[PDB]
From a paper:
H2O2 will enter through this channel to activate the enzyme, forming compound I. However, direct oxidation of typical DyP substrates, such as RB19 and other bulky dyes, by the activated haem is not possible due to the narrow opening of the channel. A possibility suggested by favourable RB19 docking by PELE is low-turnover oxidation at the DyP haem channel. Since the haem-access channel was also identified as a possible RB19-binding site, the G169L variant was also obtained, whose leucine side chain completely blocks the haem-access channel, as shown in the crystal structure of a variant including the G169L mutation, compared with the WT DyP.
In the present study, we expressed A. auricula-judae DyP in E. coli, solved the crystal structure of the recombinant enzyme and several site-directed variants, and used PELE (Protein Energy Landscape Exploration) to describe the binding of its typical substrate RB19. In spite of the obvious similarity between the two domains, only the C-terminal domain harbours a haem cofactor.
Numbering used by the authors: 3 to 448
The structure:
Amino acid sequence: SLNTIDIQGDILVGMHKQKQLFYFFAINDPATFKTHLASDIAPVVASVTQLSNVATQPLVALNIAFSNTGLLALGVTDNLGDSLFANGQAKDATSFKESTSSWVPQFAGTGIHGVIILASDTTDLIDQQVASIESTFGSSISKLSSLSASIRPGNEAGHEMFGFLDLIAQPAINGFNTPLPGQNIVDAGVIITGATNDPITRPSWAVGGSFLAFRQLEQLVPEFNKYLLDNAPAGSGSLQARADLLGARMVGRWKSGAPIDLTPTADDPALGADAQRNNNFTYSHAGFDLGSDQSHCPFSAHIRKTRPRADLGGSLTPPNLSAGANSIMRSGIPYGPEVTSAESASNTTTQERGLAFVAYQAQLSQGFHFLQQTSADNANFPPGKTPATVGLDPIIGQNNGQPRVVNGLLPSNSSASLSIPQFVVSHGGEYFFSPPISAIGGRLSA
Ligand code: HEM
């Protein structure tokens, strides 16, 4: 059975707070650090059970995860069963056709030992917790870098910086979640190390944890907006409506959350808002060839790249259950200032904003790394299409800084190709292990 009292809350349900801070640290003195890990951190680590009850939301929700070098620092030399985690994300950068030369320097190495995720409805409360941690740990912990993040304001709450409603679609864990129409249903061990049908043997103390892939992804919002206007397909509606259609073709959903597969020519804001309906699709349509039909949703659309559904086989009617092992739980949150008037007017980014991307999975090679390398960056994925060259994911696909060729986006002609500049720019990140809560004051403090 899944022991959710022992699982850190961000993994399965998110922090449920307006503000987050990602505090990236080194461990200078493992003896003193361990003492305070047990006494000061472990008691305030928020569990899935705690965060799932409206009566037990803490003022500051706190989670903590460790990199490979952070575990080594703590004298933990165990094999957690994940080569990508052990090697660190910087060594993995080439797999995604990017260079660490573009990264925040602190990420371009393995000096980061962990991340504390602090979440609260105000930054003042976060800052107070940080001050407390720095006081009680002294120099045994040291801040290397940090990133502040926030839910976006007003009617954009829950939307990412490009304006799209986010975190709609997640895997349902069999026995834990009540599945929604269309939602994939997966074994707990796809997300939680050592849980049901995780095929990789783990250290005993690590059962109930998950690997956290962190990415600092800058978004070029004015540039994206202008691109859509400049490349809007011809049609009867306003120019902006036609630009909106192109954006929806790139993401696979309208900004409202309505999936284009179910409403291919216009938004349906009521559909987007309804969790019982907004995921109820497989990409299959009777009387259309799945291998060639891009009239409902392009093969290159972001969500189709990241959850192929019927493109990888399985049921043509909902729920499609394909590629469960390639599922990730997402807890990303936007960062940076809102787009200013001047930036919008000049169509030019002058301040850094984007997504503090957080993905959880039990195997990095099957989750984040797979989705980036085998799908988003792969012009021939999904397989079996006609024509075969799908092109890259227009949102996250990478090709060493060059414009991405993306096919199928234009409804009038599925063979029409666009060469699209990057609108998402990686500043790097790291792979961490979020341990079960018992390990925090247990093995890791021993
Ligand atoms: C700044 C970068 C990104 C932006 C703006 C973005 C935006 C979005 C949006 C708007 C959706 C639709 C909402 C939803 O279906 O929940 C979505 C879905 C999703 N994204 Fe991204 N995303 C980004 C990065 C990534 C990365 C790096 C990955 C993985 C390598 C990823 C994986 C997914 C997955 C798995 C889904 C759900 C697919 C499904 O289950 O149908 N995203 N994203």
